[PDB]
Design a protein around this ligand. Structure first.
Ligand SMILES: OC[C@H]1O[C@H](OC[C@H]2O[C@H](OC[C@H]3OC(O)[C@@H](O)[C@@H](O[C@H]4O[C@H](CO)[C@@H](O)[C@H](O)[C@@H]4O)[C@@H]3O)[C@@H](O)[C@@H](O[C@H]3O[C@H](CO)[C@@H](O)[C@H](O)[C@@H]3O)[C@@H]2O)[C@@H](O)[C@@H](O)[C@@H]1O
Ligand code: NAG
Ligand code: ZN
Length: 1015
């Protein structure tokens, strides 16, 4: 039944990796079409029985934050655009307009009076104003997680269904910097039939244009059958503005942007202005315009032509609506009445274009090619590759993944119950979803906005995190308190969240210490949540005010624990060293939590007057010349000192790691007998060019290969414990930490680029794996795509997004690096992986931001590093464009993106506390996730509805029997099920009524949505 995603290489007309291997990428001057050629056409192609049908589609690109904040743009620009669109479309029944960004549209519509809301609904209902995509934003496609692309699509489309009674089936993505197949994947599973893209490499546009392959059926790289295919239109020219949308010659097209005559403060760079259309010049003007159109039409297969008419924050002033509409109407009247042109031109919408194209297709006038692959890394000209934004503003890139998980956890924890309106649960969740959705914008997560705009996004995300926390902690109190005792105050904090990795040690002192003492409080309840649908163990840590603390479960069973010091690193501006200081009053307690699928587990921390039986203490070794003492208060083991030296550590039965005298990994030995496999971490720096084009927020233009960071003799701290050991080193700009808990290590970098201008800090792994020119990186946390390093392209072109992981492998060995944040990276030589940590750039890179990147702040980046033998794995053939994780690497990714949540009871005594929730939840196969659980109804609905998105990844078969799990039927997770339906991923359309009210599990690489109804 399920397609095999490993063993069958899809047959497609265009496969982008194969295309890349054969293309030359020469940047030659093509004439007026600078990156193309002089298009020729036969005037006799079109005649009375075969006309060229031209749709001119007015639009206005509205950024939800970029050079101004969302609200600043709304007040200065977008409210006027929407108000004038309402008036002008109402008064001119033939005029049309498309709208993409529902964040703005919702902000506007809710401020309208009823009379105007009704006028607005009427111009939508009658097809004059058409929503395209309908997401909250037009998201970045490189750094965004697929879960958040879905979240923002759903937020916008749910608003549209509710208020406008429409669901777009055509997507418009004119602005993201390069394009991902994650988009057609999600859109096709959300009812879409068509999509449009624009920012692809100029060489790719030229190559596909030559073959008339700019319209294609875009399927996923593993899809043999083609059921994922989505019809895609790629625009052919350098920009989506008017000069680059009428045809190949911008000097001509610019004369048809009637906003550029002077009074609006705009002009044509090509030095020939628009002229008002009159009876005396309409023939000559129409000659010029129709020639452009016929040239553009040569690049496509049907007699239906799309002509976008818009640009950034256009259609603001009434006078602008008039100047565009009246002049185009005069052109249409002339062109359409002159039989010799054999053109019928008119204003249209995006859907009208695609409907006409498919009519031509069904008439047998065209067949379209199939395509798989992606469209990264984008270059718009010369060697200007937009790989800088894979890293820019990495603090907020990390924040995105933290909030991603908090939103999921809050929606899931609160979904189990119906909530009174006074609890404000729906209100807080809507705020959290909207702020996370806003940040998916192609100037949000990308790090390409002005400083004060980044601050705005950060503030919004902080508010969203507080909202998630409130919802989460109220939900835990309800789920774990005896119902007849449960007595909620919906404003009260029953628990506080404890997060060990955000903002992170050295970033913010934000974690509460659990305060215990014989004269204040003997013990404290803590609760862990596991959002994943399988039983999970994970080490968890809390700060406590005594080293003498023991852990129990709620059956009072002792739990083995480890206590370690609290270490903070300081750039000592007196001694000019970076070194750690230990607390003499706060300590870390660490223990293994075991939590049910989608469940909760309670533990108790209790103080005693001396070392407890079931708690051990880590040893600590500070390696440096010229040590001074490090007292640790009551901590029972004295810190040891030594000169820098190589060291080796092993936790449990796990790998043995060896480190250099500078505290950096040099080798990994998987088992007792096995080789010490060379795996070396190194930090390097890229610079900026001193002549020619400068790196900025968008572009990465290095002045050659990276140079090693000079390390000096750094201070190394080794902590050795039964449950957790670590090696931490204070390097220039980076406190680098390797943590061992018995499996693949965790890596944490506290990155503070300080005042190092024009520097990019990279973390590289050096191995002897014979990977050649091949490596793999993920797309949106959804799939791994094969990359080939191309020495015919510059270094920055071989950088790709690393939104969640990357790997290299040979016949026998693979190294996978999983990330807790999207960053840029590559494999620039056989056996290497590298990933950029931060970048600080003094110059603007001429893309409109008008500033460099000088607002850096300390960030804690997190990773897992998985070395594995892969000789026994069933891998795709050499020609397959995909790769797949192993079980260990997938689990390591989940440990970073969706860790256990930790809650500390806030008061002294928790009356009616219970030990566990979800112990009867099915424990699903490891490749299955419940990506979303969301209650879709408020408490006043007679029939309650709960939505689930179920995703199954595909993990490699490597010989592990891995057995007995339970079937997960999401429709039976809540009692009193009356109906189970399969829906689109946005939950907005029912696709199948399910027998037995049973939701089937999905196939590998598939994602399905289900809604259960409850009486
Ligand atoms: O590029 C990614 C970006 O795409 C869209 O926005 C693109 C904008 O492109 C054009 O503006 C580029 C110029 O903008 C500035 O204001 C300046 O920063 C300028 O640089 C000069 O000055 C710099 C000072 O630091 C200097 O460093 C540099 O060397 C330059 O000398 C930029 O060159 C425009 O197309 C702009 O659109 C406005 O202007 C149009 C032309 O007049 C109008 O037709 C239009 O209505 C609008 O008023 C674009 O906004 C967005 O998609 C964005 O999301 C994305 O990040
Ligand atoms: C919404 O659209 C449908 C047609 O798609 C129509 O039948 C219905 O009356 C419209 N108004 C609603 C649903 O309120
Ligand atoms: Zn934009």
């Amino acid at each position: 039944q399920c397609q095999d995603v490993v063993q069958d290489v899809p047959n497609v007309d265009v496969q982008m990796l194969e295309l890349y291997d054969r293309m030359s990428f020469k940047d030659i001057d093509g004439g007026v079409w600078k990156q193309g050629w002089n298009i020729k056409y036969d005037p006799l192609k079109y005649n009375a029985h075969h006309k060229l049908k031209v749709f001119v589609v007015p639009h206005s690109h509205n950024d939800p934050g970029w050079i101004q904040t969302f609200e600043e743009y709304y007040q200065h620009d977008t409210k006027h655009i929407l108000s004038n669109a309402l008036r002008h479309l109402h008064d001119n029944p033939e005029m049309k307009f498309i709208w993409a960004e529902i964040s703005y549209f919702a902000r506007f519509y809710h401020d309208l009076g009823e009379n105007k809301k009704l006028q607005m609904k009427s111009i939508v209902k009658n097809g004059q104003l058409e929503f395209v995509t309908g997401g909250w934003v037009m998201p970045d496609e490189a750094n965004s997680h697929w879960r958040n692309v879905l979240l923002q699509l759903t937020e916008g489309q749910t608003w549209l269904k509710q208020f406008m009674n429409v669901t777009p089936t055509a997507s418009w993505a004119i602005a993201p910097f390069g394009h991902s197949p994650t988009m057609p994947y999600i859109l096709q599973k959300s009812g879409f039939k068509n999509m449009l893209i624009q920012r692809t490499h100029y060489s790719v546009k030229k190559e596909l244009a030559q073959q008339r392959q700019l319209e294609f059926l875009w399927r996923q790289i593993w899809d043999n059958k083609g059921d994922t295919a989505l019809f895609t239109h790629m625009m052919p020219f350098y920009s989506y503005d008017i000069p680059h949308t009428c045809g190949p010659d911008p000097k001509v097209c610019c004369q048809f942007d009637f906003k550029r005559m002077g009074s609006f403060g705009l002009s044509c760079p090509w030095k020939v202005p628009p002229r008002t259309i009159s009876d005396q010049n309409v023939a000559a003007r129409s000659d010029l315009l129709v020639d452009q159109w016929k040239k553009k039409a040569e690049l496509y297969r049907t007699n239906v032509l799309l002509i976008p008419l818009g640009d950034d924050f256009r259609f603001k002033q009434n006078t602008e609506w008039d100047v565009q509409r009246v002049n185009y109407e005069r052109l249409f009247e002339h062109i359409n009445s002159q039989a010799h042109f054999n053109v019928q031109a008119q204003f249209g919408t995006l859907q009208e274009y695609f409907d006409a194209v498919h009519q031509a297709e069904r008439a047998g006038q065209a067949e379209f090619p199939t395509l798989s692959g992606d469209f990264f890394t984008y270059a718009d000209r010369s060697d200007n590759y937009w790989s800088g934004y894979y890293t820019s503003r990495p603090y907020h890139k990390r924040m995105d993944r933290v909030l991603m998980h908090y939103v999921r956890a809050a929606e899931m924890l609160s979904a189990w119950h119906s909530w009174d309106g006074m609890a404000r649960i729906e209100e807080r969740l809507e705020q959290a979803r909207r702020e996370l959705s806003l940040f998916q914008h192609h100037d949000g997560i990308t790090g390409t906005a002005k400083t004060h705009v980044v601050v705005d996004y950060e503030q919004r995300m902080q508010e969203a995190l507080k909202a998630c926390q409130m919802v989460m902690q109220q939900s835990v109190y309800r789920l774990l308190t005896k119902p007849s005792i449960y007595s909620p105050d919906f404003s009260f904090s029953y628990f506080t969240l404890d997060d060990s990795r955000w903002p992170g040690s050295g970033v913010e002192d934000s974690r509460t210490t659990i305060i215990l003492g014989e004269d204040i409080l003997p013990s404290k309840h803590v609760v862990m949540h596991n959002t994943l649908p399988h039983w999970r163990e994970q080490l968890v840590d809390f700060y406590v005010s005594s080293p003498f603390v023991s852990v129990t479960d709620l059956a009072n069973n002792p739990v083995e624990a480890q206590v370690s010091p609290v270490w903070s690193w300081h750039h000592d501006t007196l001694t000019k060293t970076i070194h750690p200081q230990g607390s003499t009053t706060k300590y870390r307690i660490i223990f293994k939590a075991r939590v049910p699928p989608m469940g909760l587990a309670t533990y108790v921390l209790t103080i005693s007057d001396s070392k407890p039986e079931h708690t051990s203490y880590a040893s600590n070794l500070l390696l440096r010349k010229n040590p001074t003492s490090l007292p640790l208060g009551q901590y029972p083991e004295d810190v040891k000192f030594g000169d820098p030296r190589e060291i080796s550590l092993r936790v449990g039965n796990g790998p043995t790691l060896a480190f250099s005298e500078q505290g950096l990994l040099k080798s990994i030995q998987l088992t007792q007998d096995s080789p010490h496999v060379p795996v070396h971490f190194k930090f390097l720096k890229y610079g900026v060019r001193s002549h020619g084009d400068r790196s900025g927020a968008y572009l990465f233009l290095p002045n050659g290969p990276a140079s090693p960071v000079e390390l000096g003799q750094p201070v190394v701290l080794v902590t050795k414990g039964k449950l957790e050991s670590s090696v931490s080193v204070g390097l220039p700009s980076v406190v680098h930490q390797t943590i061992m808990r018995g499996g693949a290590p965790e890596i944490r970098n506290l990155v503070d680029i300080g005042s190092l201008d024009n520097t990019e800090i990279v973390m590289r792994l050096e191995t002897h794996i014979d990977s050649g020119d091949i490596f793999y990186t993920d797309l949106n946390g959804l799939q791994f795509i094969k990359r080939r390093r191309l020495d015919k392209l510059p270094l920055q072109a071989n950088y790709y997004p690393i939104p969640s992981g990357m790997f290299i492998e040979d016949a026998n060995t693979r190294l996978t690096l999983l990330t807790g944040q999207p960053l840029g990276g590559s494999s620039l030589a056989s056996g290497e992986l590298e990933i950029m940590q931060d970048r600080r750039l003094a110059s603007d890179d001429e893309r409109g931001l008008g500033q460099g990147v000088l607002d850096n702040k300390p960030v804690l980046h997190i990773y897992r590093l998985v070395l594995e033998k892969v000789n026994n794995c069933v891998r795709p053939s050499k020609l397959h464009p995909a790769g797949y994780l192993t079980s260990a690497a997938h689990k390591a990714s989940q440990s970073l993106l969706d860790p256990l949540d930790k809650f500390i009871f806030a008061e002294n005594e928790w009356i009616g506390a219970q030990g566990q929730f979800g112990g009867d939840h099915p424990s699903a196969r490891e490749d299955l996730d419940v990506s979303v659980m969301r209650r879709l109804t408020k408490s006043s609905a007679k029939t309650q509805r709960v939505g689930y998105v179920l995703h199954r990844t595909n993990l490699m078969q490597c010989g592990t029997p891995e057995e007995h799990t339970q079937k997960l039927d999401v429709c039976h997770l809540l009692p009193n099920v009356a109906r189970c339906e399969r829906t689109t991923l946005t939950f907005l359309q029912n696709l199948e009524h399910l027998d037995g009210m049973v939701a089937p599990e999905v196939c590998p690489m598939e994602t399905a949505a289900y809604v259960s109804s409850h009486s």
